[PDB]
Amino acid sequence: GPLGSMALRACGLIIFRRCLIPKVDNNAIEFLLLQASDGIHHWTPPKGHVEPGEDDLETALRATQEEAGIEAGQLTIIEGFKRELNYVARNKPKTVIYWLAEVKDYDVEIRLSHEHQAYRWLGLEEACQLAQFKEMKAALQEGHQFLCSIEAL
């Protein structure tokens, strides 16, 4: 009787800084992106792994501050939006659950772990260009699509 642990469980935080008012109707929202310190230097949000008796979101919260310095006490996790990117790159399927979050401070502290060396604040277009990965462009895309469906434009 297998426990069904097939695949690795993961939780990251799609952080988005909302602006007080619209500007060019595009850069109104920005996302937090960390740059890998090695590999092809792809851009990706605070990704981490969730423990067993650990919560799914708290893992994202813990990874958000550990790989960025921003924790739930520093951002606002949006409710109603939820999606996980699951795919097996090298040879292991990884489910990643992403929640939309907004950091309270525009210049909020950004701490990167050895895995990440640099981060950039860009709009969905660049966040999508850097996150060339279709899965992230959609996560960054659907997150923006849903947030525009709440109250703020």
- Contact status, residue 115 vs residue 36, Cβ threshold 8 Å: yes
Q: How far apart are CA 36 and CA 32, in angstroms?
A: 13
Domain, as residue range, for 116? 1-153
Rounded distance between C-alpha atoms, residue 127 and residue 145, angstroms? 14
**Rounded distance, CA 128 to CA 151, Å?**
24
Residue 11's CATH number? 3.90.79.10
Q: What is the rounded distance in angstroms from the CA atom of residue 139 to the CA atom of residue 133?
A: 10
Experimentally determined by:
NMR
**Residue 47: helix, strand or coil by DSSP?**
strand
Nearby residues of 33 by Cβ (< 8 Å), 6 or more positions away: 43, 44, 45, 119, 120, 121, 122, 127, 130, 131
Q: How many domains does the chain have?
A: 1
